[PDB]
Every structure is written in C-alpha cells, then in structure tokens.
C-alpha cells in the first residue's frame, strides 16, 4: 500500500502474550511472586528464581490466597522438607521443588525469600528498565543504577496502578519503595526513592525508562 512499513519475523522470549494459563492444578491464575532470595537460604537451595518463579502450591494445597496459609504451613513444618509447586514465567512450566524451612540458616525468615501475592499472567511484560541515571538525581541517591537495574514494582494500595509512572507523581515528597531486579546479582531488592520534579534535572527521578521487548529481563537460550 502507501505504508512505508512491512512485516518481518524476529526472535522473542517464550514468556510473552501467548497466554494461555496451561494449566494450574487448582485452577487459579494467582500465586506468590518470588522476589528476593537471600543467599544460603532454604529458598536458594531449592532453586527458587527471583522475579521468574511463582509459588503455586505447598504440599498439594493451592494458594489462591494472600492469607496466612503459606506462613502457617511453613511454621508447622519448621525443619522438615515441604514440597512446593512452582510456576516459571520464563519457561511457562510447572516444577516441583523440595524446600526445608528453617531457623538455623543465618538469614531472616524460614525460607529467606521475599514474596508478593499477584498474578503471573503477563508479569514478564510489566518491567521498567532503568536507563541513564543523572548524578545527584533522586534515582542515584536512592540506589538505582543505569542499565543493570529493572524496576518491577512498588508497594501499592488502595486499588490503583499496574503501571509505574502513576506512582511517581503521587509521592512528590512522600518516600516511595520500589522492587528492583539487578541483572548482575540476578536478584530483587528494595529501593527507597524520593520523587522530586524540582530536583534540577530530567523528570522526577532523574533517570530514563525503557519498556517492552527491548527492555525485558534477559532470558537464557535454553530450558
């Protein structure tokens, strides 16, 4: 036609919009999003992968939940192996992992895993890539680092966003917490940021943001 554009095929990660929720024992679409995994933790030993793994079931019990079931089941099996059903937003697959909650490892908690109850449906898209970072910018002082860091969420209520920017204006002085994935550590951490549109530079954070296929958390070539 008159269009100066046409179509071409490109390689994209499997973790994309071909979803598909095939198929969750228990039927749900929600679970516990594995965020930070402390080192030498039970969660680490079980091979739990930050951002990519979702805890779907423990000892056969489905977690359509955000309650205290998981917490209580871990506490009741406090030094025994418990079987977990894990969903990967990377492989789009379910796998069984053995994990032994414990107080005897040197960290915090029984698994040493920071989690959040959310849906894994299209979670691999909802990523904000930190691009350039100005000196003395809010992002810099908060701990955000260029290109290595990926913003994957915040602490949010009442019913609000799935999208990042809709928070930056809300906390125009009120401090803000961010869930940040780093591609070197392959792990999540919390970042305290103080949005300031008057900080004397770019935007309210002083950093660039990438969204989309060019700005996703990297994936290995093979399962």
């Amino acid at each position: 036609s008159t269009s100066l554009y046409k179509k071409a095929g490109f390689l994209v990660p499997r973790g994309s919009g071909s979803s598909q929720s095939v198929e969750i024992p228990g039927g749900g679409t929600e679970g516990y999003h594995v965020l930070r995994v402390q080192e030498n933790s039970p969660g680490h030993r079980a091979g739990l992968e930050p951002f990519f793994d979702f805890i779907v079931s423990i000892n056969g019990s489905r977690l359509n939940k955000d309650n205290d079931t998981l917490k209580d089941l871990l506490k009741a099996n406090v030094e025994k192996p418990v079987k977990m059903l894990i969903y990967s937003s990377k492989t789009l697959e379910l796998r069984e992992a053995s994990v032994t909650p414990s107080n005897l490892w040197g960290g915090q908690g029984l698994l040493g895993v920071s989690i959040r109850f959310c849906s894994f449906d299209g979670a691999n898209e909802n990523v904000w890539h930190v691009l350039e970072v100005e000196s003395n910018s809010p992002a810099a002082l908060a701990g955000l680092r260029p290109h290595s860091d990926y913003i994957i969420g915040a602490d949010t209520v009442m019913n609000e966003s799935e999208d990042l920017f809709s928070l930056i204006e809300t906390h125009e002085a009120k401090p803000l917490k961010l869930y940040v994935y780093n591609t070197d550590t392959d792990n999540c951490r919390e970042v305290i940021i103080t949005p300031n549109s008057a900080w004397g530079g770019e935007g309210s954070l002083g950093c660039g943001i990438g969204y989309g296929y060019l700005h996703r958390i990297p994936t290995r070539p093979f399962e």
Binding site: R36, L74, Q108, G109, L110, L111, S114, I115
Partner: peptide, 5 residues
C-alpha cells in the same frame, strides 16, 4: 505488600 518468608 511484600514480606519475607
């Protein structure tokens, strides 16, 4: 919110 387990 997030919490450690």
């Amino acid at each position: 919110s997030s919490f450690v387990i």
